[PDB]
Amino acid sequence: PLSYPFNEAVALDVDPLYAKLRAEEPVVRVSCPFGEDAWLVTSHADMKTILADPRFSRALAAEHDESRLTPLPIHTSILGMDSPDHTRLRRLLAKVFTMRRVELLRPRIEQEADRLIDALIAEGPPGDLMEGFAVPFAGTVVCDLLGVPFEDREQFRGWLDAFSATTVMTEEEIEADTERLHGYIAQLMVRRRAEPQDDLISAMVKASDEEEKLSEKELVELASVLLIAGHETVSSQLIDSLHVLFTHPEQLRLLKDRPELMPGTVEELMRFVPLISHVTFARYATEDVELSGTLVRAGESVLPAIPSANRDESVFENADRFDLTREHNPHLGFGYGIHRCLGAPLARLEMQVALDSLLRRLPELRCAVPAESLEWKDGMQVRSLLELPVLW
Ligand code: HEM
Ligand SMILES: CN[C@H](C(=O)N[C@H](CO)Cc1c[nH]c2ccccc12)C(C)C
Secondary structure: OEEOOOOOOEOOEOOOHHHHHHHHOOEEEEEOOEOOOEEEEOOHHHHHHHHHOOOEEOHHHHHOOOOEOOOOOOOOHHHHOOOOHHHHHHHHHHHHOOHHHHHHOHHHHHHHHHHHHHHHHHHOOOEEOHHHHHHHHHHHHHHHHHOOOHHHHHHHHHHHHHHOEOOOOOHHHHHHHHHHHHHHHHHHHHHHHHOOOOOHHHHHHHHHHHHOOOOHHHHHHHHHHHHHHHHHHHHHHHHHHHHHHHHOHHHHHHHHHOHHHHHHHHHHHHHHOOOEOOOOOOEEEOOOEEEOOEEEOOOOEEEEOHHHHOOOOOOOOOOOOOOOOOOOOOOOOOOOHHHOOOOHHHHHHHHHHHHHHHHHHOOOOEEOOOHHHOOEOOOEOEOOEOOOEEEO
16 A cells, blocks of 8 residues: 655645546545555545544444554544534534634634734734734634633643644653643533633533533543644634735735635645645544445545645636635535534635724735745644734
8 A cells, every 4th residue: 555645734735646646546544644444535436435434433433553744643522523412512512603603702802813913013024924914813712612711822822733633742741741641621611611701611511510411521632632623723713814925926916905705715725735634533434435446344434635625626616726715615624524524614704804903004014025035844644833923
């Protein structure tokens, strides 16, 4: 089997092999950096199957040496479960993580975006849209929603990479940092259990205590992945989307002249940005399934290359082009099926507010350096810039 990943990810460049695989051999056997060999899955149609079909299981990974890019299997909480356990956590979260709760955050999210831009302007150009905007924006928002104090970022931020590192941390460092984050969240739950605030951890603890619906460990691990998704995934998608807009100035011009395009722009950025560096978490077949002429037998794993599905020309016309006017856009950037992203309404709100605020307050915003001088963060399961210097 081919060794996978075929090539380490570069900037937002997509490996040309995916297009070749989608054309000529959409499912290919590979050997993974860690765990069992796997079937790499590349097409949109097969991606929906392995993410949503009940014959593909996440919970069965725990009974294998899970095919993976990370030295140890990730503690993915709800994203590691099947029904019924999955249903139990999903339902608790749906009941507390409501559309109303998110939409009610809108004034505070808009205010935080304005405050960060006030600071950028006060500090003078060039500013860093990563550490000076995307990171503290995403961080304050998820911290406010979850009830993790943003003032604790200095302690907890250095543990998050353990949930994402592929090539750049040892087993022992990952275990230690995973334990630190879980232990940190566990102590916060003792406080929020005694002294509830208007945040997700408080309401999760209350709903769970009152129905004996979740173990402490399950609560800790679930709150932990919510922190990572809000802090790391949002800021990564946001900074990558800014790079795409800067490098497609014609589309950026169109967005500023027709702001009603912003909802569709956010969806096109979800599809076009190859945010996931390679694949999301593996699933295992419960029965034989044929995908694209390749037989995946029971007990074998599949790797969902979501970014490749989002570049599937059989689904998106000119899929290799960023077009923020695109109307047909069944992208899988928020997943699909049972494990589809519960945070997508919030992520969409954050993306819209952040891009609208920057374009309205900083109309002349532009990248301060050639795209070739940028430093990207390597060795993680998602792509992000370390710095995005800008002028206005
Ligand atoms: C731009 C931002 C985000 C992107 C691109 C994103 C992407 C995704 C994707 C692709 C999945 C499915 C993974 C798979 O099936 O292997 C997922 C699941 C999930 N996401 Fe998001 N996410 C984002 C933000 C968030 C936020 C802000 C939260 C919560 C605060 C969140 C919470 C979750 C949860 C809990 C799941 C698992 C749901 C389940 O297993 O039923 N995400 N996300
Ligand atoms: C490769 N998997 C991607 C990722 O960034 N995963 C990260 C790093 O492994 C962990 C994570 C982010 N959002 C989560 C939600 C629930 C459990 C785990 C995570 C996708 C999840 C985007």
